[PDB]
Amino acid sequence: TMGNSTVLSFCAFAVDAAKAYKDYLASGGQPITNCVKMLCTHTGTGQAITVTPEANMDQESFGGASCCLYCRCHIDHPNPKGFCDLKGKYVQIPTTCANDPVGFTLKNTVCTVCGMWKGYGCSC
Ligand SMILES: CN(C)c1ccnc(N)c1
Ligand SMILES: [Cl-]
Ligand SMILES: [Cl-]
Ligand SMILES: [Cl-]
Ligand SMILES: [Zn+2]
Ligand SMILES: [Zn+2]
């Protein structure tokens, strides 16, 4: 276990932070920990990114910024406006992927219709 500060530093100063973390995970690296887990009932809408925790029975809810590689690395978000989709919100992670919330949000996309994670919650 290399520690959160060692992993985040390695990714933060890489020319491509996302690729650095994905290559680290693929190599067998232990996921980033100390994401902020929310107390919830697991009776929510199950939507991906919400104003309040919305985990269903198949999900865990976390503080959004704690699960964002760019927020955790203190670097710019890689879009024109440098906007973060997660900061100030709550993110629902499938239980099967909740050992690595940072890797999950990095690798996945929210369906613009149902507002659930494409390939997991989404039933479109
Ligand atoms: C129903 N309960 C207690 C659940 C459901 C999903 N995930 C966790 N961690 C707990
Ligand atoms: Cl460390
Ligand atoms: Cl590099
Ligand atoms: Cl989902
Ligand atoms: Zn962020
Ligand atoms: Zn959908």
Side-chain angles (χ1 to χ4, degrees):
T1 262
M2 314 220 199
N4 290 325
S5 290
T6 299
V7 178
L8 288 168
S9 179
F10 179 81
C11 299
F13 295 108
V15 163
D16 186 340
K19 187 175 186 302
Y21 189 53
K22 288 168 191 166
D23 290 347
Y24 166 80
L25 291 173
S27 83
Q30 275 271 129
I32 293 160
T33 63
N34 295 336
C35 302
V36 176
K37 189 170 219 296
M38 304 308 291
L39 178 58
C40 61
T41 63
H42 296 273
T43 63
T45 64
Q47 295 212 74
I49 306 176
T50 56
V51 170
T52 69
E54 287 294 345
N56 68 23
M57 281 296 158
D58 303 320
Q59 298 168 330
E60 319 299 326
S61 288
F62 299 86
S66 72
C67 301
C68 176
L69 181 68
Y70 301 100
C71 286
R72 285 292 294 274
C73 286
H74 308 293
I75 61 178
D76 291 344
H77 291 70
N79 66 78
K81 291 184 180 173
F83 170 74
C84 183
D85 52 336
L86 290 167
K87 186 176 208 191
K89 291 166 129 51
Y90 301 91
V91 59
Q92 280 62 235
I93 310 288
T95 299
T96 60
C97 298
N99 64 306
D100 183 18
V102 175
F104 186 85
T105 63
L106 197 60
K107 292 167 175 178
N108 288 286
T109 308
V110 184
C111 165
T112 47
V113 187
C114 56
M116 298 183 189
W117 292 110
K118 289 179 144 186
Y120 293 90
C122 182
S123 289
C124 285

PDB file of all heavy atoms in Angstrom, residues 46-49 59 85-86 91-94 104-111 114-123:
ATOM      1  N   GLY A  46     -31.412   6.470  -7.050  1.00  0.00           N
ATOM      2  CA  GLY A  46     -30.326   5.731  -7.720  1.00  0.00           C
ATOM      3  C   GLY A  46     -29.688   6.517  -8.856  1.00  0.00           C
ATOM      4  O   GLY A  46     -28.831   5.951  -9.573  1.00  0.00           O
ATOM      5  N   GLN A  47     -30.025   7.795  -9.007  1.00  0.00           N
ATOM      6  CA  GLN A  47     -29.369   8.677 -10.010  1.00  0.00           C
ATOM      7  C   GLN A  47     -27.902   8.894  -9.627  1.00  0.00           C
ATOM      8  O   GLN A  47     -27.574   8.762  -8.435  1.00  0.00           O
ATOM      9  CB  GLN A  47     -30.134   9.989 -10.103  1.00  0.00           C
ATOM     10  CG  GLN A  47     -31.538   9.788 -10.645  1.00  0.00           C
ATOM     11  CD  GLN A  47     -31.941  11.004 -11.425  1.00  0.00           C
ATOM     12  OE1 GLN A  47     -31.467  11.217 -12.532  1.00  0.00           O
ATOM     13  NE2 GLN A  47     -32.769  11.837 -10.824  1.00  0.00           N
ATOM     14  N   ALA A  48     -27.060   9.222 -10.607  1.00  0.00           N
ATOM     15  CA  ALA A  48     -25.588   9.155 -10.511  1.00  0.00           C
ATOM     16  C   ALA A  48     -25.075  10.283  -9.616  1.00  0.00           C
ATOM     17  O   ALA A  48     -24.247  10.006  -8.714  1.00  0.00           O
ATOM     18  CB  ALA A  48     -24.972   9.209 -11.887  1.00  0.00           C
ATOM     19  N   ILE A  49     -25.504  11.516  -9.875  1.00  0.00           N
ATOM     20  CA  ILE A  49     -24.956  12.734  -9.213  1.00  0.00           C
ATOM     21  C   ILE A  49     -26.131  13.617  -8.813  1.00  0.00           C
ATOM     22  O   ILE A  49     -26.843  14.050  -9.713  1.00  0.00           O
ATOM     23  CB  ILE A  49     -23.981  13.493 -10.131  1.00  0.00           C
ATOM     24  CG1 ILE A  49     -22.866  12.581 -10.646  1.00  0.00           C
ATOM     25  CG2 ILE A  49     -23.441  14.718  -9.406  1.00  0.00           C
ATOM     26  CD1 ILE A  49     -21.920  13.247 -11.631  1.00  0.00           C
ATOM     27  N   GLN A  59     -26.121   0.477  -4.503  1.00  0.00           N
ATOM     28  CA  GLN A  59     -25.182   1.632  -4.558  1.00  0.00           C
ATOM     29  C   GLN A  59     -24.763   2.065  -3.150  1.00  0.00           C
ATOM     30  O   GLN A  59     -25.513   1.796  -2.205  1.00  0.00           O
ATOM     31  CB  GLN A  59     -25.846   2.839  -5.218  1.00  0.00           C
ATOM     32  CG  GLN A  59     -26.262   2.596  -6.666  1.00  0.00           C
ATOM     33  CD  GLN A  59     -27.160   3.704  -7.161  1.00  0.00           C
ATOM     34  OE1 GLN A  59     -27.899   4.321  -6.396  1.00  0.00           O
ATOM     35  NE2 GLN A  59     -27.086   3.983  -8.451  1.00  0.00           N
ATOM     36  N   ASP A  85     -18.300  18.397 -12.225  1.00  0.00           N
ATOM     37  CA  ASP A  85     -19.669  17.812 -12.145  1.00  0.00           C
ATOM     38  C   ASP A  85     -19.953  17.271 -10.730  1.00  0.00           C
ATOM     39  O   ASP A  85     -21.137  17.080 -10.402  1.00  0.00           O
ATOM     40  CB  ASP A  85     -19.878  16.737 -13.224  1.00  0.00           C
ATOM     41  CG  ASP A  85     -18.835  15.623 -13.302  1.00  0.00           C
ATOM     42  OD1 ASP A  85     -17.681  15.843 -12.862  1.00  0.00           O
ATOM     43  OD2 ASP A  85     -19.174  14.534 -13.830  1.00  0.00           O
ATOM     44  N   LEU A  86     -18.927  17.041  -9.907  1.00  0.00           N
ATOM     45  CA  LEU A  86     -19.057  16.273  -8.633  1.00  0.00           C
ATOM     46  C   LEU A  86     -19.035  17.204  -7.413  1.00  0.00           C
ATOM     47  O   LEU A  86     -19.746  16.908  -6.435  1.00  0.00           O
ATOM     48  CB  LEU A  86     -17.922  15.242  -8.582  1.00  0.00           C
ATOM     49  CG  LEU A  86     -18.047  14.086  -9.576  1.00  0.00           C
ATOM     50  CD1 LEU A  86     -16.753  13.292  -9.683  1.00  0.00           C
ATOM     51  CD2 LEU A  86     -19.198  13.161  -9.200  1.00  0.00           C
ATOM     52  N   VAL A  91     -22.392  11.573  -5.009  1.00  0.00           N
ATOM     53  CA  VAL A  91     -22.242  10.587  -6.111  1.00  0.00           C
ATOM     54  C   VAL A  91     -22.629   9.197  -5.591  1.00  0.00           C
ATOM     55  O   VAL A  91     -22.197   8.802  -4.470  1.00  0.00           O
ATOM     56  CB  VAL A  91     -20.843  10.634  -6.746  1.00  0.00           C
ATOM     57  CG1 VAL A  91     -19.729  10.358  -5.742  1.00  0.00           C
ATOM     58  CG2 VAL A  91     -20.754   9.696  -7.943  1.00  0.00           C
ATOM     59  N   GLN A  92     -23.462   8.514  -6.374  1.00  0.00           N
ATOM     60  CA  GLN A  92     -23.906   7.122  -6.139  1.00  0.00           C
ATOM     61  C   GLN A  92     -22.984   6.193  -6.921  1.00  0.00           C
ATOM     62  O   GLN A  92     -22.853   6.385  -8.141  1.00  0.00           O
ATOM     63  CB  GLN A  92     -25.374   6.966  -6.537  1.00  0.00           C
ATOM     64  CG  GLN A  92     -26.334   7.468  -5.465  1.00  0.00           C
ATOM     65  CD  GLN A  92     -26.216   8.943  -5.160  1.00  0.00           C
ATOM     66  OE1 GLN A  92     -26.011   9.362  -4.016  1.00  0.00           O
ATOM     67  NE2 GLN A  92     -26.362   9.767  -6.186  1.00  0.00           N
ATOM     68  N   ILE A  93     -22.355   5.234  -6.239  1.00  0.00           N
ATOM     69  CA  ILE A  93     -21.394   4.274  -6.851  1.00  0.00           C
ATOM     70  C   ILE A  93     -21.969   2.874  -6.675  1.00  0.00           C
ATOM     71  O   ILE A  93     -22.291   2.492  -5.557  1.00  0.00           O
ATOM     72  CB  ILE A  93     -19.995   4.374  -6.207  1.00  0.00           C
ATOM     73  CG1 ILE A  93     -19.473   5.814  -6.133  1.00  0.00           C
ATOM     74  CG2 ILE A  93     -19.024   3.435  -6.916  1.00  0.00           C
ATOM     75  CD1 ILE A  93     -19.065   6.412  -7.467  1.00  0.00           C
ATOM     76  N   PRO A  94     -22.077   2.060  -7.748  1.00  0.00           N
ATOM     77  CA  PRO A  94     -22.473   0.661  -7.608  1.00  0.00           C
ATOM     78  C   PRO A  94     -21.602  -0.038  -6.550  1.00  0.00           C
ATOM     79  O   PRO A  94     -20.401   0.119  -6.601  1.00  0.00           O
ATOM     80  CB  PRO A  94     -22.195   0.034  -8.987  1.00  0.00           C
ATOM     81  CG  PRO A  94     -22.159   1.209  -9.960  1.00  0.00           C
ATOM     82  CD  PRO A  94     -21.802   2.434  -9.143  1.00  0.00           C
ATOM     83  N   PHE A 104     -13.960   4.878 -10.532  1.00  0.00           N
ATOM     84  CA  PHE A 104     -15.314   4.689 -11.109  1.00  0.00           C
ATOM     85  C   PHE A 104     -15.787   5.969 -11.808  1.00  0.00           C
ATOM     86  O   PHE A 104     -16.213   5.878 -12.961  1.00  0.00           O
ATOM     87  CB  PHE A 104     -16.332   4.255 -10.063  1.00  0.00           C
ATOM     88  CG  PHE A 104     -17.656   3.937 -10.703  1.00  0.00           C
ATOM     89  CD1 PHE A 104     -17.894   2.675 -11.228  1.00  0.00           C
ATOM     90  CD2 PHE A 104     -18.625   4.915 -10.848  1.00  0.00           C
ATOM     91  CE1 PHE A 104     -19.097   2.385 -11.854  1.00  0.00           C
ATOM     92  CE2 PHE A 104     -19.833   4.619 -11.466  1.00  0.00           C
ATOM     93  CZ  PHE A 104     -20.065   3.355 -11.967  1.00  0.00           C
ATOM     94  N   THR A 105     -15.743   7.124 -11.140  1.00  0.00           N
ATOM     95  CA  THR A 105     -16.244   8.404 -11.706  1.00  0.00           C
ATOM     96  C   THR A 105     -15.384   8.774 -12.911  1.00  0.00           C
ATOM     97  O   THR A 105     -15.925   9.269 -13.895  1.00  0.00           O
ATOM     98  CB  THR A 105     -16.266   9.546 -10.683  1.00  0.00           C
ATOM     99  OG1 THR A 105     -14.931   9.812 -10.245  1.00  0.00           O
ATOM    100  CG2 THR A 105     -17.161   9.235  -9.501  1.00  0.00           C
ATOM    101  N   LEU A 106     -14.082   8.525 -12.815  1.00  0.00           N
ATOM    102  CA  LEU A 106     -13.106   8.808 -13.892  1.00  0.00           C
ATOM    103  C   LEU A 106     -13.486   8.007 -15.144  1.00  0.00           C
ATOM    104  O   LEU A 106     -13.459   8.592 -16.235  1.00  0.00           O
ATOM    105  CB  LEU A 106     -11.712   8.437 -13.380  1.00  0.00           C
ATOM    106  CG  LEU A 106     -10.528   9.002 -14.150  1.00  0.00           C
ATOM    107  CD1 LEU A 106     -10.553  10.523 -14.149  1.00  0.00           C
ATOM    108  CD2 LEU A 106      -9.233   8.488 -13.553  1.00  0.00           C
ATOM    109  N   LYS A 107     -13.848   6.731 -14.997  1.00  0.00           N
ATOM    110  CA  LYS A 107     -14.008   5.800 -16.147  1.00  0.00           C
ATOM    111  C   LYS A 107     -15.421   5.858 -16.733  1.00  0.00           C
ATOM    112  O   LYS A 107     -15.593   5.304 -17.817  1.00  0.00           O
ATOM    113  CB  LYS A 107     -13.704   4.357 -15.739  1.00  0.00           C
ATOM    114  CG  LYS A 107     -12.254   4.090 -15.389  1.00  0.00           C
ATOM    115  CD  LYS A 107     -12.063   2.773 -14.701  1.00  0.00           C
ATOM    116  CE  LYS A 107     -10.605   2.465 -14.471  1.00  0.00           C
ATOM    117  NZ  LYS A 107     -10.441   1.188 -13.743  1.00  0.00           N
ATOM    118  N   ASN A 108     -16.394   6.474 -16.063  1.00  0.00           N
ATOM    119  CA  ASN A 108     -17.821   6.283 -16.434  1.00  0.00           C
ATOM    120  C   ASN A 108     -18.483   7.606 -16.830  1.00  0.00           C
ATOM    121  O   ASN A 108     -17.898   8.677 -16.584  1.00  0.00           O
ATOM    122  CB  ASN A 108     -18.561   5.511 -15.341  1.00  0.00           C
ATOM    123  CG  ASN A 108     -18.142   4.061 -15.338  1.00  0.00           C
ATOM    124  OD1 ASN A 108     -18.541   3.304 -16.218  1.00  0.00           O
ATOM    125  ND2 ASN A 108     -17.300   3.668 -14.394  1.00  0.00           N
ATOM    126  N   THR A 109     -19.675   7.502 -17.427  1.00  0.00           N
ATOM    127  CA  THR A 109     -20.487   8.630 -17.944  1.00  0.00           C
ATOM    128  C   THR A 109     -21.940   8.491 -17.495  1.00  0.00           C
ATOM    129  O   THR A 109     -22.472   7.367 -17.519  1.00  0.00           O
ATOM    130  CB  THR A 109     -20.440   8.694 -19.473  1.00  0.00           C
ATOM    131  OG1 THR A 109     -19.057   8.676 -19.817  1.00  0.00           O
ATOM    132  CG2 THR A 109     -21.111   9.928 -20.030  1.00  0.00           C
ATOM    133  N   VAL A 110     -22.553   9.617 -17.140  1.00  0.00           N
ATOM    134  CA  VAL A 110     -23.984   9.701 -16.738  1.00  0.00           C
ATOM    135  C   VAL A 110     -24.819   9.784 -18.019  1.00  0.00           C
ATOM    136  O   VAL A 110     -24.523  10.662 -18.841  1.00  0.00           O
ATOM    137  CB  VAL A 110     -24.237  10.921 -15.834  1.00  0.00           C
ATOM    138  CG1 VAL A 110     -25.676  10.956 -15.336  1.00  0.00           C
ATOM    139  CG2 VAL A 110     -23.254  10.979 -14.671  1.00  0.00           C
ATOM    140  N   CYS A 111     -25.819   8.910 -18.169  1.00  0.00           N
ATOM    141  CA  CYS A 111     -26.858   8.969 -19.236  1.00  0.00           C
ATOM    142  C   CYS A 111     -27.657  10.275 -19.101  1.00  0.00           C
ATOM    143  O   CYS A 111     -28.154  10.563 -17.990  1.00  0.00           O
ATOM    144  CB  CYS A 111     -27.771   7.752 -19.171  1.00  0.00           C
ATOM    145  SG  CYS A 111     -29.315   7.902 -20.115  1.00  0.00           S
ATOM    146  N   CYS A 114     -31.981   9.229 -18.242  1.00  0.00           N
ATOM    147  CA  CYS A 114     -32.413   8.729 -16.908  1.00  0.00           C
ATOM    148  C   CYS A 114     -31.552   9.344 -15.794  1.00  0.00           C
ATOM    149  O   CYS A 114     -32.030   9.360 -14.649  1.00  0.00           O
ATOM    150  CB  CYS A 114     -32.367   7.208 -16.831  1.00  0.00           C
ATOM    151  SG  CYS A 114     -30.749   6.497 -17.213  1.00  0.00           S
ATOM    152  N   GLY A 115     -30.342   9.818 -16.110  1.00  0.00           N
ATOM    153  CA  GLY A 115     -29.426  10.459 -15.143  1.00  0.00           C
ATOM    154  C   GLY A 115     -28.694   9.434 -14.288  1.00  0.00           C
ATOM    155  O   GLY A 115     -28.210   9.807 -13.208  1.00  0.00           O
ATOM    156  N   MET A 116     -28.605   8.193 -14.766  1.00  0.00           N
ATOM    157  CA  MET A 116     -27.880   7.075 -14.112  1.00  0.00           C
ATOM    158  C   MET A 116     -26.628   6.727 -14.924  1.00  0.00           C
ATOM    159  O   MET A 116     -26.544   7.130 -16.107  1.00  0.00           O
ATOM    160  CB  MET A 116     -28.797   5.856 -13.984  1.00  0.00           C
ATOM    161  CG  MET A 116     -29.997   6.148 -13.104  1.00  0.00           C
ATOM    162  SD  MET A 116     -31.061   4.724 -12.837  1.00  0.00           S
ATOM    163  CE  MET A 116     -32.436   5.548 -12.031  1.00  0.00           C
ATOM    164  N   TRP A 117     -25.683   6.020 -14.300  1.00  0.00           N
ATOM    165  CA  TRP A 117     -24.389   5.629 -14.913  1.00  0.00           C
ATOM    166  C   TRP A 117     -24.634   4.688 -16.100  1.00  0.00           C
ATOM    167  O   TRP A 117     -25.231   3.600 -15.901  1.00  0.00           O
ATOM    168  CB  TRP A 117     -23.453   4.986 -13.879  1.00  0.00           C
ATOM    169  CG  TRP A 117     -22.952   5.936 -12.833  1.00  0.00           C
ATOM    170  CD1 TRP A 117     -23.287   5.948 -11.510  1.00  0.00           C
ATOM    171  CD2 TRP A 117     -22.024   7.020 -13.021  1.00  0.00           C
ATOM    172  NE1 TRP A 117     -22.619   6.951 -10.863  1.00  0.00           N
ATOM    173  CE2 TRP A 117     -21.832   7.622 -11.757  1.00  0.00           C
ATOM    174  CE3 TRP A 117     -21.308   7.516 -14.114  1.00  0.00           C
ATOM    175  CZ2 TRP A 117     -20.985   8.711 -11.569  1.00  0.00           C
ATOM    176  CZ3 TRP A 117     -20.464   8.587 -13.926  1.00  0.00           C
ATOM    177  CH2 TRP A 117     -20.310   9.181 -12.672  1.00  0.00           C
ATOM    178  N   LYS A 118     -24.144   5.080 -17.276  1.00  0.00           N
ATOM    179  CA  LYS A 118     -24.169   4.241 -18.501  1.00  0.00           C
ATOM    180  C   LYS A 118     -23.454   2.921 -18.207  1.00  0.00           C
ATOM    181  O   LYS A 118     -22.305   2.967 -17.746  1.00  0.00           O
ATOM    182  CB  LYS A 118     -23.524   4.992 -19.668  1.00  0.00           C
ATOM    183  CG  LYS A 118     -24.346   6.158 -20.195  1.00  0.00           C
ATOM    184  CD  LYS A 118     -23.675   6.908 -21.328  1.00  0.00           C
ATOM    185  CE  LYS A 118     -24.654   7.407 -22.373  1.00  0.00           C
ATOM    186  NZ  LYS A 118     -23.954   8.005 -23.534  1.00  0.00           N
ATOM    187  N   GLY A 119     -24.139   1.795 -18.418  1.00  0.00           N
ATOM    188  CA  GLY A 119     -23.565   0.438 -18.317  1.00  0.00           C
ATOM    189  C   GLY A 119     -23.770  -0.175 -16.946  1.00  0.00           C
ATOM    190  O   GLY A 119     -23.346  -1.332 -16.750  1.00  0.00           O
ATOM    191  N   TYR A 120     -24.390   0.566 -16.024  1.00  0.00           N
ATOM    192  CA  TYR A 120     -24.679   0.115 -14.636  1.00  0.00           C
ATOM    193  C   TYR A 120     -26.165   0.346 -14.354  1.00  0.00           C
ATOM    194  O   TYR A 120     -26.977  -0.519 -14.738  1.00  0.00           O
ATOM    195  CB  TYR A 120     -23.731   0.809 -13.652  1.00  0.00           C
ATOM    196  CG  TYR A 120     -22.300   0.388 -13.827  1.00  0.00           C
ATOM    197  CD1 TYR A 120     -21.456   1.073 -14.684  1.00  0.00           C
ATOM    198  CD2 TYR A 120     -21.800  -0.721 -13.170  1.00  0.00           C
ATOM    199  CE1 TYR A 120     -20.139   0.679 -14.864  1.00  0.00           C
ATOM    200  CE2 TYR A 120     -20.492  -1.137 -13.351  1.00  0.00           C
ATOM    201  CZ  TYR A 120     -19.656  -0.431 -14.197  1.00  0.00           C
ATOM    202  OH  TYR A 120     -18.363  -0.827 -14.370  1.00  0.00           O
ATOM    203  N   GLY A 121     -26.506   1.490 -13.756  1.00  0.00           N
ATOM    204  CA  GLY A 121     -27.886   1.849 -13.396  1.00  0.00           C
ATOM    205  C   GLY A 121     -28.779   2.029 -14.611  1.00  0.00           C
ATOM    206  O   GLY A 121     -29.938   1.599 -14.531  1.00  0.00           O
ATOM    207  N   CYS A 122     -28.283   2.657 -15.684  1.00  0.00           N
ATOM    208  CA  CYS A 122     -29.078   3.025 -16.892  1.00  0.00           C
ATOM    209  C   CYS A 122     -29.760   1.779 -17.470  1.00  0.00           C
ATOM    210  O   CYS A 122     -29.082   0.734 -17.567  1.00  0.00           O
ATOM    211  CB  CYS A 122     -28.217   3.673 -17.970  1.00  0.00           C
ATOM    212  SG  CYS A 122     -29.166   4.191 -19.427  1.00  0.00           S
ATOM    213  N   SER A 123     -31.053   1.894 -17.811  1.00  0.00           N
ATOM    214  CA  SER A 123     -31.907   0.822 -18.399  1.00  0.00           C
ATOM    215  C   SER A 123     -32.551   1.312 -19.704  1.00  0.00           C
ATOM    216  O   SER A 123     -33.615   0.779 -20.067  1.00  0.00           O
ATOM    217  CB  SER A 123     -32.976   0.363 -17.428  1.00  0.00           C
ATOM    218  OG  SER A 123     -32.417  -0.375 -16.351  1.00  0.00           O
TER     219      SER A 123
END
